[PDB]
A paper describes a structure:
Aggregation-prone-motifs (APRs) of proteins are short segments, which – as isolated peptides - form diverse amyloid-like crystals. We introduce two APRs - designed variants of the incretin mimetic Exendin-4 - that both display crystal-phase polymorphism. Crystallographic and spectroscopic analysis revealed that a single amino-acid substitution can greatly reduce topological variability: while LYIQWL can form both parallel and anti-parallel β-sheets, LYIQNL selects only the former. We found that a simple change in crystallization temperature or modest changes of chemical composition of the solvent system (therefore the available interaction partners) can prompt formation of significantly different nanostructures: we identified four different polymorphs of the LYIQWL and two of the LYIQNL APR peptides.
In the present work we therefore synthesized the Trp5Asn mutant of LYIQWL and found that it forms a purely class 3 amyloid crystal structure. Crystals grown from both solvents contained β-strands of parallel orientation, but arranged in different amyloid topologies. While the class 4 structure did not contain any solvent molecules, the class 3 structure contained both water molecules and two ethanol molecules, one in a solvent channel near the chain termini and another wedged into the steric zipper interface. In the class 3 topology (monoclinic crystal) the same faces of the chains interact with each other, thereby forming two distinct zipper interfaces, namely that of Leu1, Ile3, Asn5 of chain #1 with Leu1, Ile3, Asn5 of chain #2, as well as Tyr2, Gln4, Leu6 of chain #1 with Tyr2, Gln4, Leu6 of chain #2. The assembly is stabilized by a hydrophobic cluster formed with Leu and Ile side chains complemented by “pure” Asn-Asn and Gln-Gln H-bond pairs. Finally, ethanol molecules insert themselves into the zipper interface through the formation of multiple H-bonds with both Gln and Tyr side chains. Tyr side chains also interact within the steric zipper interface in the class 3 crystal structure, here again with a displaced face-to-face geometry. Accordingly, we found strong and complex Asn5↔Asn5 and Gln4↔Gln4 interactions in the class 3 structure of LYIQNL, as they form H-bond networks “with themselves” in all three directions. However, it should be noted that in this crystal, the ‘odd interface’ (formed by Leu1, Ile3 and Asn5) is a dry one, that doesn’t contain a solvent molecule, and therefore this molecular architecture may be stable even without the ethanol molecule present.
Author numbering:
A (entry chain A), B (entry chain A), C (entry chain A), D (entry chain A), E (entry chain A), F (entry chain B), ...: 1 to 6
The structure:
Amino acid sequence: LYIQNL
Amino acid sequence: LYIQNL
Amino acid sequence: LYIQNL
Amino acid sequence: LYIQNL
Amino acid sequence: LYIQNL
Amino acid sequence: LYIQNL
Amino acid sequence: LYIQNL
Amino acid sequence: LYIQNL
Amino acid sequence: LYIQNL
Amino acid sequence: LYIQNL
């Protein structure tokens, strides 16, 4: 599970 | 589980 | 579990 | 468990 | 458990 | 499992 | 498991 | 497990 | 396990 | 386990 907010 | 907010 | 806020 | 706030 | 606030 | 990004 | 980023 | 970043 | 970063 | 960073 990989979550990135950029 | 990887969470990054940038 | 890895959490980074930048 | 790794938490970093920068 | 590693917590860093910078 | 609940995930929300806003 | 609950994850929210805002 | 509850995670919130705001 | 509860984690909140604000 | 409770963790809060503010």
